[PDB]
Point group: D2
Chain length 225, copies 4
């Protein structure tokens, strides 16, 4: 699972943090390494830096690494750092939500002044959604009719089931997750269309990325449109 | 308040129900009268009719009037009956969610085989949203950034505060409500764009309807197309 | 995982269902097998039987096996069937909530006219909670202070984390789960005390049951008192 | 409604705050005045004091008066300040939850090193629960069986309905509120018994106060012991 490349991008990403910044703390294994680096760098350099978490996980990690936490209802974010399940090469469109936290991730990431994605090179894809389903957070009363709508749109949609709870996985917001495989022609339009299905709260297509840091065997390349 | 006209429309609407149907049970004063009529009809004619609620209000009234409730996750709705805050005369577009329940309302109403709106004549308007704000259900962590997005779209947005609970009104789904006055040029497109703001769950613009029953002093008229 | 003994108990349990009943549908592998048997019986005998689910799992299985679902807010349950993580041999006290659904389970199971536990023989224990921790559903804001409370009570408490969603496991009600090992010397009082910790929603000690059906190699035995 | 008395208690209460403390920020009109006073004192004396909110209201007010906010999952509370609907004179037992926020209030207030209640003189009563119902926060699926349980206990239990939303008032936690009139013979035991009803999250009886500051025409008096 490319941990050395993940750590490499985390250590490079943390250099972008400046004293006085409010930083969005992403979710997933790559973000988690970044949160540890930020925690270290805050302590060792006596920085005044606050974090806004994108999940209970990010919140609990921040606490462990002693990053002061604030909320988006109180502060704007200077830079949001987050991972991705896929990054489309030519567009820098993402699929996120493998970890079931795409809703709070999007809220922070799209609202930050800058949104930086942190990935190892294996996340790069030629075609978004070819090999990874789109996560969709759904109001529980609407699961059947959202599966219908997604199926009408050409998707193969399945409810995400839990490993440590019986039945559907539940998000930090109390909703279910449907994962849907789609042939994505126009990712911007598809993101809009899925969100307009009654019962859909948010989906894992991200189309507003400022830049992508990619850990490779050679180093860290930056991608920007 | 037009109670006479509301009762008239409810009494006429209940005649559309056929034995064996699953009926969507709307929310608000007019839908409440309909639920009473439906319960009375089920009793007096011994119909086998089930209901699917759009709110905890609808669930409680169904209990009170002995309408057996099933779930949208198992059954499609033959006819959904619901109220509206505004019905635009030329388009039959609606604003709903004055009572805070537009999200579950839309899940039921848009998915019903037939969606029938029940209003008294006072709800008819020349221009949608000229005199009533659009309810928007919002993930609580996102309220500040959603207010910003709505303001940047030209809206006057205010968080709805409560009287029987201190602070923000909370929906049946656990979220907050922002009410936003907007100049609605293209209702179909605005509905879509509001839903694509991160942190927005659903909004009160409704642009799909089968027919609108309107209680007037001379009787109930049916609007369609 | 004793699938023969679980299937055996499910097949015997379904015989207790009578035409016209409302049946509580439990959660977990043994309950799932019962739900299938029930659906088969309803179909092959053309029974008029309704279900009330204890979880999103039970809801989905009821859909799959064509059991019409109603609500506890409208109907009482004739017989609730559910599984257990442990059944104490002398008292028939249980631990439930291994699958994270103990809160809704307890709501249904304690209120049913008859509550029937279904287990294979491996679930029988000499001492409740010696080898299995008590699940505790917790308001997220409270997890730290609940860990403290449970520790004061002599428990070793740990937040349940997931792998299909990053971070804490979230219940069907949107809360967290703390699992706590305790030396249980009065189950009835411990259940009551845990529930009086601020931030605790419900716990997995069950001290009310009508009978326990146990699948053994020599047949299904029935335990009571 | 005794506004000058509330103000005078708030002004006296704020003197109890010391630099470096973490303070619990209560809910309701009297607490809101306290929050204003605290915000003023933090700014004017350049205190390093943090607040932990007991509601979305308290969080919103803190932000408005620029009190830095932390969470109970991160920090313990030195002093929690909160209001009350009733304060029984001889015992200092309280009823809280008039504003629908008793659950988060109890989580903070019971966990504080010191819990201070702020009331005007009109909140003092001879007998707890004689003139005011006990708020009870209830899992929505359980409202009928919880009404039943409370009624079996001798209570007159009624669902609290909203005025700025249709149907049941919903808490910050996404649950319903049932208000129940009871003849309270043993408050400590009743608090425990109500909490052990399946589907009850928390109730408004509070039995653990350190002191009560009372606003009277003459001044502010401290009740303790
Ligand atoms: Cl995620
Ligand atoms: Cl509404
Ligand atoms: Cl479970
Ligand atoms: Cl309150």
């Amino acid at each position: 699972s490319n941990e050395d490349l993940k750590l490499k991008v985390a250590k490079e990403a943390v250099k972008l943090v400046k004293d006085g910044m409010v930083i969005g703390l992403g979710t997933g294994s790559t973000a988690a390494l970044f949160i540890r680096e930020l925690g270290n760098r805050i302590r060792e350099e006596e920085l005044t830096v606050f974090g806004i978490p994108t999940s209970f996980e990010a919140k609990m990690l921040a606490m462990q690494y002693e990053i002061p936490l604030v909320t988006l209802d109180e502060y704007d974010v200077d830079i949001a750092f987050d991972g991705a399940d896929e990054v489309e090469e030519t567009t820098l469109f993402l699929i996120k939500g493998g970890g079931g936290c795409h809703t709070q991730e999007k809220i922070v990431d799209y609202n930050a002044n800058e949104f930086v994605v942190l990935v190892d090179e294996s996340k790069l894809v030629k075609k978004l959604g070819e090999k990874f389903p789109i996560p969709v957070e759904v109001i529980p009363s609407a699961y059947r009719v959202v599966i219908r709508a997604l199926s009408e749109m050409g998707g193969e949609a399945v409810i995400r089931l839990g490993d440590r709870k019986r039945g559907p996985v539940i998000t930090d917001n109390g909703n279910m997750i449907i994962d849907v495989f789609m042939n994505i022609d126009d990712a911007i339009e598809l993101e809009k269309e899925i969100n307009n299905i009654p019962g859909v709260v948010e989906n894992g297509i991200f189309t507003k990325v400022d830049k992508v840091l990619v850990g490779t065997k050679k180093g860290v390349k930056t991608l920007k449109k």
